[PDB]
Design an enzyme around this catalytic site. Structure first.
Site, short mmCIF file in Angstrom:
data_model
loop_
_atom_site.label_atom_id
_atom_site.label_comp_id
_atom_site.label_asym_id
_atom_site.label_seq_id
_atom_site.Cartn_x
_atom_site.Cartn_y
_atom_site.Cartn_z
N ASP A 45 -8.95 -3.75 -6.64
CA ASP A 45 -8.50 -3.15 -5.40
C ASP A 45 -9.15 -1.76 -5.27
O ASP A 45 -8.91 -0.89 -6.11
CB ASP A 45 -6.97 -3.07 -5.38
CG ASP A 45 -6.42 -2.63 -4.04
OD1 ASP A 45 -7.14 -1.97 -3.26
OD2 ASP A 45 -5.24 -2.94 -3.75
N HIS A 61 -7.55 -5.34 -1.08
CA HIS A 61 -6.40 -4.46 -1.09
C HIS A 61 -5.18 -5.20 -0.60
O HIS A 61 -5.07 -5.50 0.57
CB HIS A 61 -6.68 -3.22 -0.24
CG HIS A 61 -5.50 -2.29 -0.13
ND1 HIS A 61 -4.85 -1.79 -1.23
CD2 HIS A 61 -4.86 -1.79 0.96
CE1 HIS A 61 -3.86 -1.00 -0.83
NE2 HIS A 61 -3.84 -0.99 0.50
N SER A 95 0.85 -1.19 0.00
CA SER A 95 0.00 0.00 0.00
C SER A 95 0.89 1.26 0.00
O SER A 95 1.65 1.44 -0.93
CB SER A 95 -0.96 -0.05 1.20
OG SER A 95 -1.69 1.14 1.33
#
Length: 463
Positions: A406, A433, A171
């Site tokens: 995502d 995600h 991320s």
């Protein structure tokens, strides 16, 4: 780094002093916290991970990752996590809000975008920015950005005794990644970036793409739930957004947008509208949380909000005793210095108008013609980075893992990052995600072969 046993493995913990200002290398000093899981077999070096956020603890994340780490990887690498400057156990930790500050915000509907509403929100924001300054001082806040995190990572690289870095970024960890790659390309052994942040993106278009992600994840959840018995959103997914608003809008006084009518919970707070929305978003990080979302929505049918509140707590990192970690405050500080904030009101207003159209599940009522500015438009220290196309010509081939649906880091972000990096794009077909070291055999094999062998997935690799 003098190591020492931890407070759940063979774990060693330690600390590492880096300077706050790197131009004042004898100035104030920060101490980063580190955890270490010694390799079992023959050690190539250290696998350093970052979970993202920003504001998320890497020490915390390594303890989780340790559970799902392929045996071969655990053989070949010390698993190492760190808390970045200002984050969790690193000192000094960013602190702006108290536990009561946070609760007070979360109790509000946060839905009124009239002039009075925007002035109220913009006033809480100013109070927040002021709380950060009074507790942290402007110097520290000026240096919490990724560009300096990148420099600490190299100090980490060296302190662990590896000549070149092996790094797994999740991320926002992805931005730490490309940053380190641009500053120390010749010190990168291998790099996996999963759930990509594209540092050349326009922030408003990015946010809108993210809105579109969560709406599309919403659509997927609802379509899935509609196959199931007693779907709280109904058996027709084309009306799920309306059903959803019939469940959450009553949490807001219809005659007055600023009044919470919380759903009943065994917790004293009840469930505000804003918590309801936050719980939903949290659940749309992963199909693993869909059951919980469905539970929360079914509770709403009986005017209860216990599961959604707990989802909101998971998102906000509020433990059972009402205590927050500093992930939120750090999140903001770091985000605010990583790029110049949108300061044009018309831009913010036009973004709002589009977002209501793109992500209705998230929007309450109608476009008002006004919208608040984000916390960052009020930041007292200037950005230490700015959008640009990643350029690291000498870099070893890297792997970027991008998931087709995502919500947080949309698929095409990952493609774009791969291109600027001129590395391999590994696709995961899913609505979640990130995915690396989270149970999927295929992804994990690819990642293991790259980490040990140096072998990239073939062009078009899907999983």
């Amino acid at each position: 780094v003098e190591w020492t046993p931890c407070r759940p493995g063979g774990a060693l913990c330690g600390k590492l002093a880096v300077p706050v200002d790197y131009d004042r290398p004898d100035g104030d000093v920060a101490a980063l916290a580190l955890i270490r899981f010694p390799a079992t077999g023959d050690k190539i070096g250290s696998l350093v991970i970052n979970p993202g956020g920003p504001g998320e603890s890497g020490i915390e994340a390594a303890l989780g990752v340790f559970q799902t780490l392929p045996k071969r990887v655990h053989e070949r690498f010390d698993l190492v996590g760190f808390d970045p400057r200002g984050v969790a156990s690193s000192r000094p930790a960013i602190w702006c809000n108290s536990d009561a500050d946070n609760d007070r915000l979360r109790a509000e509907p946060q839905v009124d975008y009239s002039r009075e509403g925007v002035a109220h929100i913009e006033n809480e924001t100013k109070q927040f920015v002021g709380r950060c300054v009074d507790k942290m001082g402007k110097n520290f806040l000026a240096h919490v950005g990724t560009v300096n995190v990148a420099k600490d990572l190299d100090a980490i690289r060296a302190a662990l005794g590896d000549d070149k870095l092996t790094y797994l970024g999740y991320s926002y960890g992805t931005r730490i990644g490309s940053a380190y790659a641009e500053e120390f390309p010749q010190r990168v052994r291998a790099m996996i970036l999963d759930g990509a942040v594209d540092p050349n993106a326009d922030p408003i278009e990015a946010e809108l793409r993210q809105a579109k992600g969560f709406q599309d994840a919403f659509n997927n959840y609802a379509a899935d739930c509609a196959k199931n018995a007693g779907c709280p959103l109904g058996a027709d997914p084309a009306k799920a957004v309306e059903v959803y608003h019939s469940l959450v809008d009553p949490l807001v006084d219809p005659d007055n947008p600023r009044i919470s009518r919380p759903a009943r919970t065994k917790d004293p707070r009840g469930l505000s509208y804003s918590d309801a929305i936050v719980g939903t978003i949290m659940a749309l990080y992963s199909p693993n949380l869909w059951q919980h979302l469905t539970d929360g929505l079914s509770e709403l049918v009986d005017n209860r909000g216990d599961t959604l509140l707990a989802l909101a707590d998971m998102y906000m990192r509020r433990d059972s005793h009402g205590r927050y970690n500093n992930s939120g405050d750090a999140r903001v500080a770091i985000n605010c210095v990583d790029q110049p904030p949108v300061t044009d009101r018309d831009k913010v207003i036009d973004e709002d108008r589009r977002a209501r159209e793109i992500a209705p599940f998230m929007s309450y009522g109608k476009f008002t013609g006004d919208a608040p500015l984000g916390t960052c438009a009020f930041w007292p220290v200037p950005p230490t980075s700015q959008p640009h196309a990643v350029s690291a010509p000498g870099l070893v081939p890297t792997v970027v893992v991008s998931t087709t649906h995502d919500p947080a880091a949309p698929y095409k972000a990952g493609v774009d990052l791969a291109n600027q990096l001129r590395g391999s794009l590994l696709t995961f077909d899913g609505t979640q995600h990130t995915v690396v070291f989270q149970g999927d055999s295929c992804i994990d094999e690819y990642v293991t072969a790259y980490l040990i062998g140096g072998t990239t997935p073939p062009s078009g690799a899907k999983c």
